[PDB]
Amino acid sequence: LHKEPATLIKAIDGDTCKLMYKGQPMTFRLLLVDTPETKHPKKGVEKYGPEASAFTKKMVENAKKIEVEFDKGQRTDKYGRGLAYIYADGKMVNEALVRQGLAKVAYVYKPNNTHEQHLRKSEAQAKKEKLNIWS
Numbered sequence: 001l002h003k004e005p006a007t008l009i010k011a012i013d014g015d016t017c018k019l020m021y022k023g024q025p026m027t028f029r030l031l032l033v034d035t036p037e038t039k040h041p042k043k044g045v046e047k048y049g050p051e052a053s054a055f056t057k058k059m060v061e062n063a064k065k066i067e068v069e070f071d072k073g074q075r076t077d078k079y080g081r082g083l084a085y086i087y088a089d090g091k092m093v094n095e096a097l098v099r100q101g102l103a104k105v106a107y108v109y110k111p112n113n114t115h116e117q118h119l120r121k122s123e124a125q126a127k128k129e130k131l132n133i134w135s
């Protein structure tokens with residue numbers, strides 16, 4: 001995989017944001033994870049959704065540099081959102097949320113699952129420590 005620079009435009013919630021990539025503004029969705037919902041009324045405001053948003057928001061608002069890393073399969077989902085592993089100063093946001101028990105590993109679609117085991121191992125640790133979602 002290869003990392004590429006991006007510019008933060010607006011953090012939406014725990015796992016979705018707007019970034020300037022390749023000169024064009026677009027919304028991104030974190031690969032392999034799911035932070036709780038805060039928008040869609042069908043799900044309503046789920047437990048830890050606000051917490052995840054705030055964590056993602058802080059993490060990325062103070063970053064000197066942001067990079068996006070696409071997996072080996074499709075780069076956008078059906079909603080037109082870019083699918084990537086996103087790093088804030090070399091720290092993978094997808095993994096940081098799972099490690100805190102603020103996201104579960106989800107939507108594992110081959111072949112976009114390169115860092116699946118890494119995330120699995122951090123989710124297991126968050127579970128054993130009874131963190132947030134696992135509390």
Ligand SMILES: Cc1cn([C@H]2C[C@H](OP(=O)(O)O)[C@@H](COP(=O)(O)O)O2)c(=O)[nH]c1=O
Nearest residue numbers: 016029030031032033034077078083107109
């Ligand atoms: C992470 C991710 C989400 N999705 C889809 C599955 C879900 O579709 P449906 O909306 O049809 O259920 C939705 C979950 O994203 P949200 O957590 O943003 O809702 O996005 C993909 O298509 N591929 C992905 O890699």
Ligand SMILES: [Ca+2]
Nearest residue numbers: 015034035036
């Ligand atoms: Ca979500």
